[PDB]
Amino acid sequence: MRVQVSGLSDETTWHTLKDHLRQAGEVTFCKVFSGGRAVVEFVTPEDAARAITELQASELEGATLFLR
């Protein structure tokens, strides 16, 4: 259930990323890296599956986000 996030704004923090992802499901782990990357773990596989299907190319703080 670890999902990789890419394309994030330099400004984006785990607070704004977790809030965005919560549309798909709750988050138990969230680490924001440099270069617009993050690693996230959802509570359930269902949450991860919805995130990876429903939030591709979604917009967050001006940036286009991708999940892997």
Residue numbers in the entry: 202 to 269
Task: Give the authors' words.
The structure was solved by molecular replacement and refined to final Rwork/Rfree values of 18.1%/22.9% to 1.95 Å resolution. Comparison of the RNA-bound RRM domains with that of the apo RRM structure shows no significant structural changes take place upon U4 RNA binding. The TbRGG2-RNA structure has a complex asymmetric unit. However, four similar TbRGG2 RNA complexes were revealed. In each of these complexes two RRMs combine to simultaneously contact one RNA using a unique binding mode distinct from that observed in other RRM–RNA complexes. In this novel RRM-RNA interaction, binding by the two RRMs splays apart the U4 substrate, suggesting a mechanism by which the protein may mediate melting or stabilization of single stranded RNA U stretches. In the TbRGG2 RRM-U4 structure, the uridine O2 and N3 atoms are read by the backbone amide nitrogen and carbonyl oxygen of RRM residue Cys231. In addition to the RNA contacts from the Cys231 backbone and the side chains of Phe230 and Trp215, several basic residues either make contacts to the RNA phosphate backbone (Lys219) or are positioned to provide electrostatic contacts to the RNA, such as Lys230.
TbRGG2 is a 330 residue protein and contains two main domains, an N-terminal glycine (Gly)-rich region composed of GWG and RG repeats and a C-terminal RNA recognition motif (RRM).
